Structure formats: structure tokens, C-alpha cells
């Protein structure tokens, strides 16, 4: 896959539509779209274990991580494969989302297709707020909106 | 992946949940749960091509076709990679679905995951009603659900 792309849905008034763009299978992946709704600030934004939203958000299961490594940030050697930490809301409640990341992929053993994006209440604090859960989820709080990542043209 | 999830959403009353289990990488895949909301009788039921959802099932493109052959029914050696066929609406406008299914797989090229189920209008013609439409999509019509295949645990 060099495209995919994921509609995320959920309670309140979270949604959006997230694109991801994998140019070759052994390069980045640009991960770029809006999601409205969000409030002013920064939400952890990660991609869960599994890609089944039959209890909703709740049912993804924790952040993708195939490796076994405690929860950090993206530009941590030490992070879980779904750790793309935080995305910024603007004043008009929009994360018009723009990253890239080399750890994630659409193809191989970091595949994120058939997964879950999420979204999250509150900022990720990238492994660094020094308790147990920090060093799981980064405090990030609530699953405000989900959805699984699919393979697009 | 040994199992996967799809929970089946539309414009209308039409939702359901349907479970994979493959055993063996080169086994058959099960299928099987339920989809309501359906008028009695016959439903086209398919995997289509991309797992996009953000035109919900219009943007998920045709059936799922990697081998570039013609409609057919599941147990044709002439079919789509995404042609399960028909599930049953009971009076009641429950379908129970079970199958199992040796062409689909949760892994490899024949691989289902990040692409779209899709549940039709009207009964699935596999292939055999003698004219063009049947020969692509059965002439099962509308799009009344779909969801995106996620792994499951
Ligand atoms: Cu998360
Ligand atoms: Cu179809
Ligand atoms: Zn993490
Ligand atoms: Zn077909």
C-alpha cells in the first residue's frame, strides 16, 4: 500500500478524515488531514492495537506496540510503533494534522492497516509525566474519536 | 492475522457486526454474526476494494479484484476475491450470517484487512444473469452498509 486513510468517528462532536502516504515501503509515512470539534490545545493522537470498534474506541485495545517498548514520544528510540504524539487544535476547535513519521508503515511488521487512529482527550506527554501511566498511554486521557485505518487509491 | 472485526454502518436502519477467524495462514477464513435492518430474502454481500469510507460505502470502490477476473459466486473458480455472495434476511429482518470461505485471507495478497464490507439491496445474481452488470457486481445494487476490516483480538 502507498495510501491509506481513516474517517474517525465517536461520541461527541470529534471527526475528521485522516490521509496517510507512504511514497516507498522503506520511507516515511505522511500522515496529514483535519479533524474538527477538538478543543483548543494538544490531543494525543495514536494508532491502537486492534481495528475493531464494536464497543467503540474502547475496543482498539492500547497503542500498537509489536516491539514490546514502553510509551514515548515520535522522536524517541524508546516508543510503542503507534507513538505519534501530539496533534495541536487550533481557537476554532481544528487540528489540521501534519506529520511524518519513519516508524509506522503500510506494509511489513509496523503495518497500521486494519487498525485503529485515535484521538484523545487530553495532551500526550510523551512518556515524561514520571508515573506507570505515563510510561503506558501518556496520560493522553478519554478516546475522543476512532476509526480503522484502510487501504485507499 | 487469525482474526479480524467489521461493524457494518449506512444512511439507513441497516447495521451489524460481522467476525473473521483464520486459523492456518493457508486455511479458509469463517465468517459469521449478524446484520439487521434488511427487507427478507437475499442481500449481495462483498468485500470491496479500498477501506475508504469518507463518501461511506460509495468511496469504496469495486469488488475487490487483485486476480482481474469476472463476478461470480464463492464457490466459483471465476470470481472476484471479494465475492462471498448472499446472506439470508429472515422475516424479521435479521440475517445470520455463516461462512467460510477459501479464497479471502486475513494475511498475504488475497489479504481482506483495511478493506470494505459491503451489504447490498438486492440478491447477488453470481455472476449468471446474462448481462454486463452481472459480470462485475452481480446486479446486487445499492450499498446498504459497510465498515472497514480491522484485526481483532
Ligand atoms: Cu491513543
Ligand atoms: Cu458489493
Ligand atoms: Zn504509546
Ligand atoms: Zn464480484
Same mark, same amino acid.
Given at each position: 500500500?502507498?495510501?491509506?486513510?481513516?474517517?474517525?468517528?465517536?461520541?461527541?462532536?470529534?471527526?475528521?478524515?485522516?490521509?496517510?502516504?507512504? @511514497?516507498?515501503? /522503506?520511507?516515511? +509515512?505522511?500522515?496529514?488531514? #483535519?479533524?474538527?470539534?477538538?478543543?483548543?490545545?494538544?490531543?494525543?493522537?495514536? +494508532?491502537?492495537?486492534?481495528?475493531? /470498534?464494536?464497543?467503540?474506541? =474502547?475496543?482498539?485495545?492500547?497503542?500498537? /506496540?509489536?516491539?514490546?517498548?514502553?510509551?514515548?514520544?515520535?522522536?524517541?528510540?524508546?516508543?510503542?510503533?503507534?507513538?505519534?504524539?501530539?496533534? =495541536?487544535?487550533? @481557537?476554532?476547535? %481544528?487540528?489540521?494534522? #501534519?506529520?511524518?513519521?519513519?516508524?509506522?508503515?503500510?506494509?511489513?511488521?509496523?503495518?497500521?492497516?486494519?487498525? =485503529?487512529?485515535? %484521538?484523545?482527550?487530553?495532551?500526550?506527554?510523551?512518556? @515524561?509525566?514520571?508515573?506507570?501511566?505515563? =510510561?503506558?498511554?501518556?496520560?493522553?486521557? #478519554?478516546?475522543?474519536?476512532?476509526?480503522?485505518?484502510?487501504?485507499?487509491?
Amino acid at each position: 500500500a502507498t495510501k491509506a486513510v481513516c474517517v474517525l468517528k465517536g461520541d461527541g462532536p470529534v471527526q475528521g478524515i485522516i490521509n496517510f502516504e507512504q @511514497k516507498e515501503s /522503506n520511507g516515511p +509515512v505522511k500522515v496529514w488531514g #483535519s479533524i474538527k470539534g477538538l478543543t483548543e490545545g494538544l490531543h494525543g493522537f495514536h +494508532v491502537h492495537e486492534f481495528g475493531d /470498534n464494536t464497543a467503540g474506541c =474502547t475496543s482498539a485495545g492500547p497503542h500498537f /506496540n509489536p516491539l514490546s517498548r514502553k510509551h514515548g514520544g515520535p522522536k524517541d528510540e524508546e516508543r510503542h510503533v503507534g507513538d505519534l504524539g501530539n496533534v =495541536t487544535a487550533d @481557537k476554532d476547535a %481544528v487540528a489540521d494534522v #501534519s506529520i511524518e513519521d519513519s516508524v509506522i508503515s503500510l506494509s511489513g511488521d509496523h503495518c497500521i492497516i486494519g487498525r =485503529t487512529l485515535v %484521538v484523545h482527550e487530553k495532551a500526550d506527554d510523551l512518556g @515524561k509525566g514520571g508515573n506507570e501511566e505515563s =510510561t503506558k498511554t501518556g496520560n493522553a486521557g #478519554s478516546r475522543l474519536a476512532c476509526g480503522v485505518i484502510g487501504i485507499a487509491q
